[PDB]
């Protein structure tokens, strides 16, 4: 009676969750934009009415792809650069005591060593100023990386400044964006759009503080794969950035040493003037109000009358125990002890100063046997950034105590990329469909 | 009421629109299905998109629906696949809902369409012989 027959429809708007390789689009840098398609001046966003999709920031393959691409670009930016194999020599080091502060005693080592020249049968006695973290005593010292692997000097002209990158899908694939404010990264998103690709995401490498990132539109956002599991990192996104001013005030001097044919090693000659610790400044009132907002948002998950305590990092490598980042070529590791130090009970122009240590021997990603040497930067360096989020970890959390402890965390840059790709997913279009209709061939 | 013609909703704007309303924008989705280490992944992605498009086109051709966006077939609709009438399909559902419902009755229909197209080709060859 029905008299129904199969009918094939092509171009149906149906998609399935899929994993594919996205490509870079952008408007000397480590993040190579010369191999990226130009970004369209007028990107098109199609707002899908009535479409409710499923999103999960913690299983997004986009984060893994971004991590892999960033690591690949970092590796490729270092291939055509000098390998400092000859630098692994015995170093005769003395203390730098000329115009140093009480907090810089023993932090800089004036190390003299023999070095190769452009002629294979000649040697030159040179000297350089190394950092205490970069050398280990064997008055005789050696570079920290010597017993692990040789370090590749970063090419001086290549710039470390993050550049925005757009990740766009191939033909037949669509990037779905969740426009729902207050969205916590997991679950059903009712307000959805299709975009050729995302906003420009800057690959900022940082620990314990998300820098130069996107801000929440409505309020501070707390996100976790499993909030009740203390082993899962908590991503906090701010709605108002906190200005942080980080400076190395030493007037560094760079000198070139010819270590071979067409091979130059950039040493730190002599600091011009007083030697004092690099540091960072954060507004006290702004940080206090931001922590109050974070406490308010955390009370929604951990009870209305719980005590919220911010404490120091538990321990581990210098990368994770300190706010590690790069500011104008130099690699800062800042002791964020004045920030996460407070207790909150349910009920001026001064600023917090975070001391920082500079490092030249860098293991940017969590790898062993692949190290990079940062050439010294000429002159004082000062830079200003927005703290837009935090990577926290809950300490224990047994039923014995009603107090919740949160400590800074990080190390894995996948969390940093997840904070920007949380509202994005990739799907593959299934244009073919079959339906019943009265029509017959 | 009065009207001022049709409108354009975008690449997947009709995803939330009903199946009858979503069938009005087939060409919009159809048009966009085609368009030293990173020169390989890009080429792999382009090749994969080409293969998927050609697989879809080959299926449509071997079903006798070459060059058609809406194609009637001679295969009857077995009631086991779906017992819903037209009133609650084309005006009260989306193509995504139909896909989630019918995704487990797909390959059998494809094989039936292929065999039916082959039978039609043989029958047409026999008819033209007279």
């Amino acid at each position, epitope marked *: 009676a029905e008299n129904l027959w199969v009918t094939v429809y092509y171009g149906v708007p149906v998609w399935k969750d899929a994993e594919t390789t996205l490509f870079c689009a952008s408007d000397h840098n480590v993040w190579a934009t010369h191999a990226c398609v130009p970004t369209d001046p007028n990107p098109q966003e199609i*707002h899908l009415e009535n479409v409710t999709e499923e999103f999960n920031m913690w299983k997004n393959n986009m984060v893994e792809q971004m991590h892999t691409d960033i690591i690949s670009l970092w590796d490729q930016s270092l291939k055509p650069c000098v390998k400092l194999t000859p630098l692994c020599v015995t170093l005769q080091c003395t203390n730098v005591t000329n115009n140093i502060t009480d907090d810089m005693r023993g932090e800089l080592k004036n190390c003299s060593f023999n070095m190769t020249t452009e002629l294979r049968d000649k040697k030159q006695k040179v000297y350089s100023l190394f950092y205490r973290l970069d050398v280990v005593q064997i008055k005789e010292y050696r570079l920290i990386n010597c017993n692990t692997s040789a370090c590749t000097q970063a090419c001086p002209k290549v710039s470390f400044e993050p550049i925005p990158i757009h990740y766009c899908a191939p033909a037949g694939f669509a990037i779905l964006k969740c426009k729902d404010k207050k969205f916590n990264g997991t679950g059903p998103c009712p307000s959805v759009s299709t975009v050729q690709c995302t906003h420009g995401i800057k690959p900022v490498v940082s620990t314990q503080l998300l820098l130069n990132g996107s801000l929440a539109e409505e309020e501070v956002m707390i996100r976790s794969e499993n909030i009740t599991n203390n082993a899962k990192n908590i991503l906090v996104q701010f709605n108002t950035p906190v200005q942080i001013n980080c400076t190395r005030p030493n007037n560094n001097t760079r000198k070139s040493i010819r270590i071979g044919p067409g091979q130059a090693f950039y040493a730190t000659g002599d600091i011009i003037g007083d030697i004092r610790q690099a540091h960072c400044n954060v507004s006290k009132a702004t940080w206090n109000e931001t922590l109050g907002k974070v406490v308010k948002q955390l009370r929604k998950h951990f009870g209305n009358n719980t005590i919220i305590r911010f404490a120091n990092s538990s321990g581990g490598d210098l990368e994770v125990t300190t706010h590690s980042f790069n500011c104008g070529g130099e690699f800062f590791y800042c002791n964020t002890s004045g920030l996460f130090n407070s207790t909150w009970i349910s009920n001026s122009n001064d600023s917090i100063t975070l001391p920082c240590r500079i490092k030249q021997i860098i293991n940017m990603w969590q790898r062993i046997g692949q190290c990079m040497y940062a050439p010294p930067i000429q002159g004082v360096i000062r830079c200003v950034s927005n703290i837009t989020g935090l990577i926290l970890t809950r300490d224990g959390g047994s039923t014995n105590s009603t107090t919740e402890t949160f400590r800074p965390g990080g190390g894995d840059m996948r969390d940093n990329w997840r904070s920007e790709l949380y509202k994005y997913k990739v799907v593959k279009i299934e244009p073919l469909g079959v339906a019943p209709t009265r029509c017959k061939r | *009421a009065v009207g*001022i*013609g*049709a*409108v354009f*909703l*975008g690449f997947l704007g009709a995803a939330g629109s009903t199946m009858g309303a979503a069938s009005m924008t087939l060409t919009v989705q159809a048009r966009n299905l085609l368009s030293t280490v990173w020169g390989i992944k890009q080429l792999q992605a382009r090749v994969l998109a080409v293969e998927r498009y050609l697989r879809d086109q080959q299926l449509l051709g071997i079903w006798g629906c070459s060059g058609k966006l809406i194609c009637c077939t001679n295969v009857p609709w077995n009631s086991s696949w779906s017992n819903r009438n037209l009133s609650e399909i084309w005006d009260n559902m989306t193509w995504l809902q139909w896909d989630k419902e019918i995704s487990n009755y797909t390959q059998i229909i494809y094989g039936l369409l292929e065999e039916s197209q082959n039978q039609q080709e043989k029958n047409e060859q026999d008819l033209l012989a007279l």
Partner: antibody, heavy 122, light 107 residues
Framework: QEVLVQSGAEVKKPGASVKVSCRAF????????LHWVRQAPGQGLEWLGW????????TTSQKFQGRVYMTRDKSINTAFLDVTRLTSDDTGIYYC???????????????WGQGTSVTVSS | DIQLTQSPSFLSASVGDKVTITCRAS??????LAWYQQKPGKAPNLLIY???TLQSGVPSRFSATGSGTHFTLTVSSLQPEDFATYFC?????????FGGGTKVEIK
């Protein structure tokens, strides 16, 4: 998330021409018919006309024919309303509104712009 | 042009009462009427479309009935935010026109 933003207030002399812009965010600009309406101070609303942002087709009230024109730019998602030969009766608040436009016909004016005040006086 | 007459022109009622506004059309309008609410110094908002369907995000107290030439907008329980101007607008034939306007004020 659907919002319509128009140009600022305008003051003009009689017999001049005025342009009113209306840009859209939060939805596909070519997906809904756009109405242009006016309201005089202390009076009711009066429907100037409407336009199809996709095909560019326009329909104007018969009393306004030959005096008010409508255009749209898709590259930057805006509708322009040109009102020429203004008089002291044309003073008021002009609004651009998105239509629900179900079934490709007028249904309701769900999203409204914040409006622009046009003042005509010697 | 089609004339839409709205009654009462002015109305005073207290919170918790019931208010009915009648919009009458000179010609026939099957279901192509919309009810709009406008406040001082603000653009109107869509209360009802199709003369019987409540706009999404509107409180359930609002309701509409009637087809053809007679239409009625009913607010069962008034609230302090419901005291403002109400319009009825038809779209069956050109030119579209709005109602004269009914202003509701707290007593």
């Amino acid at each position: 998330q659907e919002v319509l933003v128009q140009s600022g207030a305008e003051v003009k002399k009689p017999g001049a021409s005025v342009k009113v812009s209306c840009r859209a965010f939060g939805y596909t600009f070519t997906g809904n018919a756009l109405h242009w309406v006016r309201q005089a101070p202390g009076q009711g609303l009066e429907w100037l006309g409407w336009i199809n942002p996709h095909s560019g087709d326009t329909t104007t009230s018969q009393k306004f024919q030959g005096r008010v024109y409508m255009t749209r730019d898709k590259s930057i998602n805006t509708a322009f309303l040109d009102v020429t030969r203004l008089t002291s009766d044309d003073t008021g608040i002009y609004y651009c509104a998105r239509d629900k436009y179900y079934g490709n016909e007028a249904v309701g004016m769900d999203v409204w712009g914040q409006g622009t005040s046009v003042t005509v006086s010697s | 042009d089609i004339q839409l007459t709205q009654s009462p022109s002015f109305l005073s009622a207290s919170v918790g009462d019931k208010v009915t506004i009648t919009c009458r059309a000179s010609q026939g309008v099957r279901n192509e009427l919309a009810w709009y609410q406008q406040k001082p110094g603000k653009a109107p908002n869509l209360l009802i479309y199709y003369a019987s369907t409540l706009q999404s995000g509107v409180p359930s107290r609002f309701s509409a009935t009637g087809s053809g030439t007679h239409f009625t907008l009913t607010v069962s329980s008034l609230q302090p935010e419901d005291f403002a101007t109400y319009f009825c607008q038809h779209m069956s034939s050109y030119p579209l026109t709005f109602g004269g306007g009914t202003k509701v004020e707290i007593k």
